[PDB]
């Protein structure tokens, strides 16, 4: 048994209203009221389609991942990671792929800066299409379960997916939903040995998930990095100024790139 699983159990034991408070406790939020209000009205212009744009922003503006070349966005959902990549100096093709359909997030068409370089496909399942060439590989897949055993298999499927997609020097950002289970640790140590990078916690993540992202330009003992987060997440159960701090939302320009 791990320090993560302790966290998981305490989390699971929470009152409905107690969990809602834990979730936002001392996190970083993104200011989305107006951007969402604009989208509801048609505006295709300056708005990130989701808070993922801001979320990826954070890794990128710190050179943890430098999208370049042909970017594949596995599970692009609405499109927040892709449209944000679309505007990035070093970037040529953005290809975003996602399930969509009833009960899943569908890609929203946007005219943001570099939109013309972004193509997003709904109706695809990625675990069952063939790997393609790419320079930057992104992946935000991993559905949360109260049962950590579940999360570990979901997380395992994902890494096993990404491997098949990766070559040498590939820029990458992958959600590892449950990095604390011992099966996931094991896989990650391998993956790191073979590919580099470390796991990093994004301050925009809620306290109710123990997600960390495997990002390419970083280093660090996996085990230790997972633990300092389980510790962090446990410490936040007992918190005494539990407001969130807010960032203004990414503004993603408009119009076309050549
Ligand atoms: N096997 C699969 N194939 C394609 N899409 C999948 C998938 N499993 C999960 N997904 C999709 O992956 C998405 C990840 S969450 C979307 C976040 C996105 N980066 C953004 O910033 O908006 C979900 O919307 C889900 O529908």
Instruction: Please choose, from the candidates 165, 123, 161, the residue with its C-alpha nearest in 3D space to the C-alpha of residue 142.
Output: 161
Pair type for strands 245-248 and 28-31: parallel
> CA-CA distance, 83 to 136, in Å (whole number)?
14
In angstroms, how far is the first alpha carbon of the chain from the final one?
53
Q: How far is the CA of 78 from the centre of ligand 1 (A)?
A: 8
Pair type for strands 212-215 and 171-176: antiparallel
Structure tokens at 171: 């820029």
Neighbours of 100 (CB within 10 A): 18
> Which CATH number do you get for residue 137?
3.40.50.150
User: Dihedral of CA 145/149/154/159: which sign?
Assistant: positive
Instruction: Please choose, from the candidates 60, 56, 53, the residue with its C-alpha nearest in 3D space to the C-alpha of residue 217.
Output: 60
Q: Under the phi-then-psi rule, with left for phi > 0, alpha for psi from -120 to 50, and beta for the rest, what region is 91?
A: beta
Which residues lie closer than 8 Å to 26 by C-beta, 6 or more apart?
207, 236, 239, 241, 242, 243, 244
Q: How far is the CA of 62 from the centre of ligand 1 (A)?
A: 24
Q: How far is the CA of 148 from the centre of ligand 1 (A)?
A: 20
Instruction: Give the count of domains, the chain.
Output: 1
Q: How far is the CA of 1 from the centre of ligand 1 (A)?
A: 30
> CA-CA distance, 187 to 185, in Å (whole number)?
6
Pocket-testing residue among 77, 121, 213, ligand 1, by greatest number of atoms within 8 A of Cβ: 77
Elucidation technique: X-ray
Please identify which residue in the block is written with the tokens 């300056």: 46
Structure tokens at 82: 């892709």
Q: How far is the CA of 239 from the centre of ligand 1 (A)?
A: 32
CA angle 168, 170, 176 (to 5 degrees): 115
Q: Under the phi-then-psi rule, with left for phi > 0, alpha for psi from -120 to 50, and beta for the rest, what region is 47?
A: beta
CA dihedral 89, 52, 227, 136 (to 10 degrees): -40
Ligand 1 site, residue 170, Cβ cutoff 6 A: no
> CA-CA distance, 48 to 83, in Å (whole number)?
8
The β-bridge partners of 136 are 71, 171
Model resolution, angstroms: 2.8
Ligand 1 site, residue 197, Cβ cutoff 6 A: no
Please identify which residue in the block is written with the tokens 């935000």: 140
Ligand 1 site, residue 82, Cβ cutoff 6 A: no
The length of the chain, given as a count of residues: 258
Which residues form the domain of 80?
A: 1-258
Ligand 1 site, residue 140, Cβ cutoff 6 A: yes
Ligand 1 site, residue 50, Cβ cutoff 6 A: yes
Ligand 1 site, residue 77, Cβ cutoff 6 A: yes
CA angle 50, 55, 60 (to 5 degrees): 130
Pocket-testing residue among 75, 136, 144, 249, ligand 1, by greatest number of atoms within 8 A of Cβ: 75
SS3 per residue for the chain: CCHHHHHHHHHHCCCHHHHHHHHHCCCEEEECHHHHHHHCCCCCCCCCCCCHHHHHHHHHCCCCCCCCEEEEEECCCCCHHHHHHHCCCCEEEEEEECCCCCCCCCCCCCCCCCHHHEEEECCCCHHHCCCCCCCEEEECCCCCCCCHHHHHHHHHHHHHHHHHHCCCCCEEEEEECCCCCHHHHHHHHHHHHHHCCEEECCCCCCCCCCCEEEECCCCCCHHHHHHHHHHHHHHCCCCCCCCCEEEECCCCCCCCCC
On whether 69 is known to bind a ligand per the annotation, the reply is no
If you take atom 3 of ligand 1, which residue's CA is the nearest one?
A: 125
Burial class (CB in 10 A: 0-12, 13-18, 19+), 107: buried
């Amino acid at each position: 048994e791990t320090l993560g699983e302790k966290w998981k159990s305490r989390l699971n034991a929470l009152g409905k209203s107690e969990f809602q408070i834990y979730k936002k406790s001392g996190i970083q939020e993104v200011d989305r009221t107006l951007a969402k209000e604009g989208i509801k009205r048609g505006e295709t212009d300056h708005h990130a389609v989701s808070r993922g744009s801001a979320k990826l922003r954070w890794f990128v503006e710190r050179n943890l991942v430098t999208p370049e070349g042909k970017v594949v966005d596995l599970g692009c959902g609405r499109g927040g990671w892709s449209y944000y990549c679309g505007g990035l100096k070093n970037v040529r093709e953005v290809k975003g792929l996602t399930k969509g359909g009833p009960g899943h997030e569908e890609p929203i068409p946007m005219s943001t800066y570099g939109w013309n370089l972004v193509r997003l496909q709904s109706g695809v399942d990625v675990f069952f299409i063939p790997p393609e060439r790419c320079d930057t590989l992104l992946c935000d897949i991993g559905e949360s379960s109260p049962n950590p055993t579940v999360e570990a298999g979901r997380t395992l499927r994902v890494l096993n997916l990404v491997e098949n997609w990766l070559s040498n020097n590939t820029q990458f950002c992958v959600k590892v939903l449950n990095p604390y289970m011992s099966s996931v640790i094991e896989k990650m140590e391998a993956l790191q040995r073979k590919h580099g990078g470390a796991l990093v916690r994004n301050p925009l993540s809620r306290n109710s998930t123990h997600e960390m992202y495997w990002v390419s330009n970083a280093s660090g003992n996996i085990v230790s990095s997972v633990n300092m987060i389980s510790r962090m997440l446990i410490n936040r159960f007992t918190m005494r100024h539990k407001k969130a701090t807010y960032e203004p939302d990414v503004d993603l320009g408009s119009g076309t790139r050549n």
